[PDB]
Amino acid sequence: KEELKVIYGDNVDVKHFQASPRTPVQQLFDSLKNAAANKERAAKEAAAAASPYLAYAVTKKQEVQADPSNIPFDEVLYPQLSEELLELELSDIREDEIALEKA
Amino acid sequence: WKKGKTVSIENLNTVTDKYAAALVPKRKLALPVLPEGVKKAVEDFAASVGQAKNASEVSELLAKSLAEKAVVTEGGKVVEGFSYVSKAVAAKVIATRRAEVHE
Amino acid sequence: WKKGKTVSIENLNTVTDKYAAALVPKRKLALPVLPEGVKKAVEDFAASVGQAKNASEVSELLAKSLAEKAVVTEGGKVVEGFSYVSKAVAAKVIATRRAEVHE
């Protein structure tokens, strides 16, 4: 909820994104949906910065975070880990299936 | 910083450049953002042939088709033959596997 | 042509301009040809994000999606709300109707 409230508001409907998570294509298009409101927010935060160092740091932090290629995907970064997280879930489903096959 | 000297803004900004360079993932999806120089060039050609009412919807299909085949880059260079299973695809695998065991 | 005068190439060419203007149909489909100024602008952006191996195949989907919604113009202006049934769609109607009666 805390990762998707900044896109979809307070009533996130977490159940829909839990059953079907967002695609990398879908994660791109919500990053570009608020890309106009984020760059304007980075301008007003750099203007209200206390120092020129704090003004450069917010524009540099937002320039990295505006890029949707800078979205870290654990399926891309650690591929053998993400297939291990998949077979972690599928083994619990398989152990329930062996109990039904024994019956 | 040296005891007699004083740290300057140019050295402080390359340090923040080093922090934000670590925010970039080691291996990332090259999720393409459609540039406005490409986006309105398509939308003026769509308005050239009378399709200005669906000129925007054409540019979304151009943006999605570039995004559906988004490639994986590591050092800026494309990792050749890289296969990844996303979290939305993996949760679709889990849900049909749960529905097999539940029925 | 007058009996003392002599017909010039400028008058002969506007006459051939009048013949070729009749070759243009009174109501025509605005079938869009993708301009190369738009085509390589998409293909350089596709090569910008590492998709240069499928840069050409992206431009075909942009050309087809503009062509699948090709609009109908009469005097250069779009005929609003114009529906037409093509010969490929009509022959698909005939073939399933023949297959209904044959079975």
Side-chain angles (χ1 to χ4, degrees):
Chain A
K1 173 139 177 170
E2 74 164 339
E3 296 175 0
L4 273 54
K5 66 183 293 184
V6 311
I7 295 100
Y8 303 96
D10 288 330
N11 35 46
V12 185
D13 195 286
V14 186
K15 160 71 212 182
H16 163 254
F17 297 108
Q18 183 173 35
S20 64
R22 292 183 292 131
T23 319
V25 174
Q26 189 49 236
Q27 279 184 77
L28 157 74
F29 281 125
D30 304 285
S31 71
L32 299 183
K33 178 162 63 192
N34 317 328
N38 278 16
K39 186 171 73 175
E40 191 271 332
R41 191 170 39 85
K44 67 181 290 294
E45 286 184 10
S51 89
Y53 180 74
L54 283 177
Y56 176 79
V58 58
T59 62
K60 179 51 69 154
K61 186 186 175 176
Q62 201 266 348
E63 185 179 2
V64 173
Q65 288 176 346
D67 208 316
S69 178
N70 285 340
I71 299 176
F73 297 104
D74 293 358
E75 45 261 35
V76 178
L77 272 166
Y78 320 102
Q80 65 270 13
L81 179 82
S82 294
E83 69 173 22
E84 272 155 46
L85 282 163
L86 169 77
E87 66 158 49
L88 202 76
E89 294 291 327
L90 290 195
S91 277
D92 197 49
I93 304 162
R94 182 63 214 275
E95 287 297 321
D96 287 26
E97 199 196 40
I98 296 171
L100 304 155
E101 284 175 353
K102 280 173 185 167
Chain B
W1 175 34
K2 327 275 199 184
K3 189 71 171 177
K5 278 79 174 176
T6 296
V7 54
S8 73
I9 187 66
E10 288 86 29
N11 185 259
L12 274 158
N13 282 347
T14 61
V15 162
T16 312
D17 266 327
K18 286 215 201 67
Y19 299 151
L23 269 181
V24 183
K26 291 183 180 64
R27 202 183 309 126
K28 58 193 192 169
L29 261 176
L31 282 182
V33 182
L34 202 65
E36 189 66 31
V38 186
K39 183 162 128 51
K40 70 101 175 180
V42 171
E43 271 179 74
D44 295 350
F45 172 65
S48 176
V49 294
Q51 305 192 58
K53 284 154 54 73
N54 59 89
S56 85
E57 197 270 330
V58 160
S59 65
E60 315 185 0
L61 308 163
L62 175 66
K64 289 189 288 291
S65 65
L66 274 168
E68 290 294 328
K69 284 166 300 187
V71 79
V72 165
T73 57
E74 194 163 25
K77 43 184 64 63
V78 164
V79 187
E80 293 293 328
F82 191 85
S83 289
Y84 74 103
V85 179
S86 66
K87 287 185 195 300
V89 167
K92 191 71 174 68
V93 165
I94 288 160
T96 72
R97 187 53 180 153
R98 281 178 179 172
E100 277 163 49
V101 165
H102 168 74
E103 71 182 0
Chain C
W1 175 34
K2 327 275 199 184
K3 189 71 171 177
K5 278 79 174 176
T6 296
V7 54
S8 73
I9 187 66
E10 288 86 29
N11 185 259
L12 274 158
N13 282 347
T14 61
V15 162
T16 312
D17 266 327
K18 286 215 201 67
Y19 299 151
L23 269 181
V24 183
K26 291 183 180 64
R27 202 183 309 126
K28 58 193 192 169
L29 261 176
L31 282 182
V33 182
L34 202 65
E36 189 66 31
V38 186
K39 183 162 128 51
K40 70 101 175 180
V42 171
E43 271 179 74
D44 295 350
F45 172 65
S48 176
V49 294
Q51 305 192 58
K53 284 154 54 73
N54 59 89
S56 85
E57 197 270 330
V58 160
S59 65
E60 315 185 0
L61 308 163
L62 175 66
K64 289 189 288 291
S65 65
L66 274 168
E68 290 294 328
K69 284 166 300 187
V71 79
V72 165
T73 57
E74 194 163 25
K77 43 184 64 63
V78 164
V79 187
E80 293 293 328
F82 191 85
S83 289
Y84 74 103
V85 179
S86 66
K87 287 185 195 300
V89 167
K92 191 71 174 68
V93 165
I94 288 160
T96 72
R97 187 53 180 153
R98 281 178 179 172
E100 277 163 49
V101 165
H102 168 74
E103 71 182 0

